[PDB]
Amino acid sequence: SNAMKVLLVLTDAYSDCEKAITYAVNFSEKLGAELDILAVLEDVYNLERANVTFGLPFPPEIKEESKKRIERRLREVWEKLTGSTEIPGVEYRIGPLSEEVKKFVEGKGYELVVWACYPSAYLCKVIDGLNLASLIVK
Amino acid sequence: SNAMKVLLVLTDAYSDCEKAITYAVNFSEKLGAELDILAVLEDVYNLERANVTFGLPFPPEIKEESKKRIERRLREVWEKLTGSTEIPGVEYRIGPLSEEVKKFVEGKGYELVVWACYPSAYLCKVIDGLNLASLIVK
């Protein structure tokens, strides 16, 4: 299969990134790429850590709230561009971006990774540590 | 118009960069983008410098030949993808990459920059500085 394997990486903290989601849809459609979506819940992760550190409690529903904000944002763009709201399945990982992207992506052969509106300064390292093209959407 | 403006940034130093040039072509083709090409002769620049410091002769052929190799390399990939040798015009600039790209892009409305295999490690600052998406092709 010559299907360009692409991964869209989303953050629950920067779920409003139409430009990135658009790039992905265009690769999927116009370039026939095999698209997968990974959403890292970094904010939910920081909650877990504040919990351990200060004993700050938080409702398990928080996970779902983020999952839905993300999924809604996907449908909006997908429908707007594709007239359809059938989006890919979303894989959720709770932890540090770099670390989680690395784990997830390993040995899956992704030719490209599209980073959704995440602060560039913090990607510099991972992008280098990864052997695949990176599309930094600002 | 509603045609996405993309800039392909080629460099003096890093020759063999087919993958990057390829992504660029595809955007022009499948994604109907208005692609422009910019080649920063960084190696030539660093030479004019060592010239001044040491006063060693600096033949005009170096520059011309540097442009010719680049053009050849474009044609190869271009031709391999589209049966045509017809290639966009290349704009040459002689200076530090980071510096030259900022100036060139200056209010031109480019929304995406495809980096031609220049070490991603060195672009960290420039990518963050720029207000457009960056496709790092390793």
Curated annotation (Swiss-Prot), chains A, B:
Annotated Pfam families: Usp
Family: Belongs to the universal stress protein A family.
Protein name: Universal stress protein Aq_178
